[PDB]
Amino acid sequence: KEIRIILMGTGNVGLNVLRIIDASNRRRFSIKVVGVSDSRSYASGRNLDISSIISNKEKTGRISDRAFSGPEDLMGEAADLLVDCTPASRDGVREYSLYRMAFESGMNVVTANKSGLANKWHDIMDSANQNSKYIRYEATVAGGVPLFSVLDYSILPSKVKRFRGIVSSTINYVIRNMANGRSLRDVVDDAIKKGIAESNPQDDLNGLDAARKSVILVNHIFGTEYTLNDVEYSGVDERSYNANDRLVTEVYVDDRRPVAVSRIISLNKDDFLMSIGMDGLGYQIETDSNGTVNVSDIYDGPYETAGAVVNDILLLSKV
Amino acid sequence: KEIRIILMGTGNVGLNVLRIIDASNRRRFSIKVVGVSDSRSYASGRNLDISSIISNKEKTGRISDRAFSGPEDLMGEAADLLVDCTPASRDGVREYSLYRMAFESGMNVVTANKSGLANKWHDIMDSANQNSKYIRYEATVAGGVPLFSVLDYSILPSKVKRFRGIVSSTINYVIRNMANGRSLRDVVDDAIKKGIAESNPQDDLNGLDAARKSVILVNHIFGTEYTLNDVEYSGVDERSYNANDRLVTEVYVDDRRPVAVSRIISLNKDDFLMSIGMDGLGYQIETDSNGTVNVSDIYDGPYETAGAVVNDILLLSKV
Numbered sequence: 243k244e245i246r247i248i249l250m251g252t253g254n255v256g257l258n259v260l261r262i263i264d265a266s267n268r269r270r271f272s273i274k275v276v277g278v279s280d281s282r283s284y285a286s287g288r289n290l291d292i293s294s295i296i297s298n299k300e301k302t303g304r305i306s307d308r309a310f311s312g313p314e315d316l317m318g319e320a321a322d323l324l325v326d327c328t329p330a331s332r333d334g335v336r337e338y339s340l341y342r343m344a345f346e347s348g349m350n351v352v353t354a355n356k357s358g359l360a361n362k363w364h365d366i367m368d369s370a371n372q373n374s375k376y377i378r379y380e381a382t383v384a385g386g387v388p389l390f391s392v393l394d395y396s397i398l399p400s401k402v403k404r405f406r407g408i409v410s411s412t413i414n415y416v417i418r419n420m421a422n423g424r425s426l427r428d429v430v431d432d433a434i435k436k437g438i439a440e441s442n443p444q445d446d447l448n449g450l451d452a453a454r455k456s457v458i459l460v461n462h463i464f465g466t467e468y469t470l471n472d473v474e475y476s477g478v479d480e481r482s483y484n485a486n487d488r489l490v491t492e493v494y495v496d497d498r499r500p501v502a503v504s505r506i507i508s509l510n511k512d513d514f515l516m517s518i519g520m521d522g523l524g525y526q527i528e529t530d531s532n533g534t535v536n537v538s539d540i541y542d543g544p545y546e547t548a549g550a551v552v553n554d555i556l557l558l559s560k561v
Numbered sequence: 562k563e564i565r566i567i568l569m570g571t572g573n574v575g576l577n578v579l580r581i582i583d584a585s586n587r588r589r590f591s592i593k594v595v596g597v598s599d600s601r602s603y604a605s606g607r608n609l610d611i612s613s614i615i616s617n618k619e620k621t622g623r624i625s626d627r628a629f630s631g632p633e634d635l636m637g638e639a640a641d642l643l644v645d646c647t648p649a650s651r652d653g654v655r656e657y658s659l660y661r662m663a664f665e666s667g668m669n670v671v672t673a674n675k676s677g678l679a680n681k682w683h684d685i686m687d688s689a690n691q692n693s694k695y696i697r698y699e700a701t702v703a704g705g706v707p708l709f710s711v712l713d714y715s716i717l718p719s720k721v722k723r724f725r726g727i728v729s730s731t732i733n734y735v736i737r738n739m740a741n742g743r744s745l746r747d748v749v750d751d752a753i754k755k756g757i758a759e760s761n762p763q764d765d766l767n768g769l770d771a772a773r774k775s776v777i778l779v780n781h782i783f784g785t786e787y788t789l790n791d792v793e794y795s796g797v798d799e800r801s802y803n804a805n806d807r808l809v810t811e812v813y814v815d816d817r818r819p820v821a822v823s824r825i826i827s828l829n830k831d832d833f834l835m836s837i838g839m840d841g842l843g844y845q846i847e848t849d850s851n852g853t854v855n856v857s858d859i860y861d862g863p864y865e866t867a868g869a870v871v872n873d874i875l876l877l878s879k880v
């Protein structure tokens with residue numbers, strides 16, 4: 243009948259998460275938001291008025307006029323699930339702490355934030371295990387393109403041999419647009435307007451966003467507990483880019499060891515990844531029992547990413 | 562720990578279903594096959610030896626030397642699930658009868674066969690409802706491309722506004738190859754070699770395979786109970802085909818009524834469907850909360866279709 247959530251972060255993605263929940267509730271499970279924050283304020287309570295919170299955030303830039311000190315402020319209400327739409331920390335410790343607090347409080351977790359899982363996979367899964375809880379992370383790789391839900395429920399009979407995809411938006415948008423002769427400033431301005439740039443855009447340009455995604459992918463698919471120290475990645479540099487250059491993230495096994503690598507590649511015309519449009523993301527998974535499957539979208543933005551977060555909420559409602 | 566199945570039909574798709582199950586069991590839930598048939602013979606028992614059955618079918622063309630009269634022959638063993646890999650009947654009545662028997666016997670159903678659902682959706686769902694059982698049908702539209710599992714578990718928050726795809730293989734392969742100047746015989750020979758042609762290949766050429774898929778799609782997505790009488794379809798004709806012609810199946814709402822239409826269309830260069838290779842299938846779903854999602858594969862054959870069937874078996878194991 244109803245799932246109670248706490249939402250941390252109400253920016254590009256988190257405010258859209260509220261919008262989707264509100265639209266969903268109006269069709270009528272029910273998703274009841276019992277706690278919500280931004281960096282400075284919060285709301286907490288049994289019957290929180292989501293459209294009113296959306297309106298107040300849009301108009302004033304704040305969730306409320308009630309100062310937020312940390313996650314502890316939100317643990318006064320019984321909830322089933324914590325949703326993390328906060329920006330990446332440098333080391334993942336803040337996120338680990340949040341998820342651990344959630345798990346110990348009887349909650350599962352849904353996250354769009356990549357830093358906790360990219361840095362602290364081991365400690366996060368240990369706390370999940372010890373508390374008998376779950377974490378889902380659809381939005382952490384290729385925002386709005388179905389990926390982990392596909393791997394979890396569409397190719398159950400298979401071993402995955404390889405993953406290759408365009409999964410980090412801003413770096414790819416930058417490379418493609420600079421190949422057309424645009425300045426970095428202009429492209430970055432467009433990425434911000436679209437809502438796809440990281441809260442720290444240097445994370446995009448140095449390839450760190452892709453790197454984080456590659457950790458989550460390799461650990462998910464091959465069962466490893468790698469960190470950023472174990473993957474290879476590259477950022478944008480001063481080269482003149484070609485029209486067919488893309489920042490491709492690959493996960494596969496080399497000499498019995500899983501590898502995660504993000505690199506700039508000049509793609510062949512017939513590569514599936516070249517079918518992906520300027521505003522989209524996508525990937526290809528090679529499997530041993532379900533063939534080679536290709537998945538992409540047309541426009542991958544914070545709204546679509548929010549839809550991935552809400553899909554995760556609904557998948558966890560059935561546990 | 563274990564799911565017990567009965568498999569009806571051990572042709573291109575069904576023998577691969579056994580192969581996948583056997584490979585799966587060797588990695589070690591367990592899928593235990595307690596009944597299996599082809600048109601003339603069957604095996605039934607607690608500890609059936611799948612690799613031995615595969616070998617006997619491959620070598621001799623028969624499952625066993627024990628005459629099969631109908632589904633009743635297989636109901637002596639307790640099972641959780643019936644799998645239908647039999648060919649399409651003209652009217653769906655045989656399939657309805659089979660599923661009804663299964664449901665009443667305490668079993669769920671997984672099917673690759675499109676005719677029951679395309680003709681008898683209402684009666685089949687009624688019997689499922691009345692007996693509190695389920696039916697899954699991943700393999701019935703676009704063999705090995707994940708479709709219903711995507712709609713069920715990857716875009717839960719959304720309303721689907723439209724579906725468009727290349728989902729009927731043989732007719733598309735024929736059109737594309739004849740556009741290259743090949744004779745019908747040569748192309749049909751290749752389709753049979755690949756294992757993608759229907760047991761009655763006229764079902765492919767007159768567009769009936771696509772039509773059946775369109776019924777299943779419109780009923781699944783929009784909640785209707787249409788039959789073949791309610792959809793529009795076309796077959797191959799004597800025209801000279803263009804390089805960009807494809808038989809596209811669309812499902813959408815026109816003036817408040819859902820519509821299902823399969824038709825030959827000359828696609829634009831930038832259409833996602835033009836990214837689909839000669840041996841593949843794929844589609845695009847427009848959604849209101851998860852964007853527009855594209856899904857395809859590289860080689861859609863009876864092995865990949867079998868993998869879709871086994872995914873359905875594994876999804877039902879968790880009920």
Ligand SMILES: NC(=O)C1=CN([C@@H]2O[C@H](COP(=O)(O)OP(=O)(O)OC[C@H]3O[C@@H](n4cnc5c(N)ncnc54)[C@H](OP(=O)(O)O)[C@@H]3O)[C@@H](O)[C@H]2O)C=CC1
Nearest residue numbers: 251252253254255280281328329330354355385441543544
């Ligand atoms: N943009 C995209 O399409 C994609 C985003 N993601 C991930 O989603 C997450 C959110 O992205 P996005 O919404 O664009 O980011 P934003 O910067 O737009 O929003 C971040 C939100 O969290 C708040 N916040 C910042 N620091 C803290 C803090 N330490 N504790 C609590 N709240 C905090 C912000 O406060 P305030 O409103 O006061 O600024 C804001 O509400 C990121 O981790 C990102 O990597 C994943 C895939 C796609």
Ligand SMILES: NC(=O)C1=CN([C@@H]2O[C@H](COP(=O)(O)OP(=O)(O)OC[C@H]3O[C@@H](n4cnc5c(N)ncnc54)[C@H](OP(=O)(O)O)[C@@H]3O)[C@@H](O)[C@H]2O)C=CC1
Nearest residue numbers: 570571572573574599600647648649673674704760862863
């Ligand atoms: N080929 C493909 O990739 C696709 C197939 N499908 C569907 O899968 C189903 C099977 O296709 P495919 O394996 O190619 O077909 P085949 O003709 O190769 O195999 C059919 C199997 O069923 C047996 N059979 C025929 N009639 C009956 C009967 N009335 N009762 C019990 N068994 C019977 C056949 O017997 P015997 O071995 O004695 O001939 C054979 O074992 C079809 O409905 C098809 O539409 C769906 C998507 C993709």
Ligand code: NA
Nearest residue numbers: 380383384387
């Ligand atoms: Na995703």
Ligand code: NA
Nearest residue numbers: 699702703706
């Ligand atoms: Na399918």
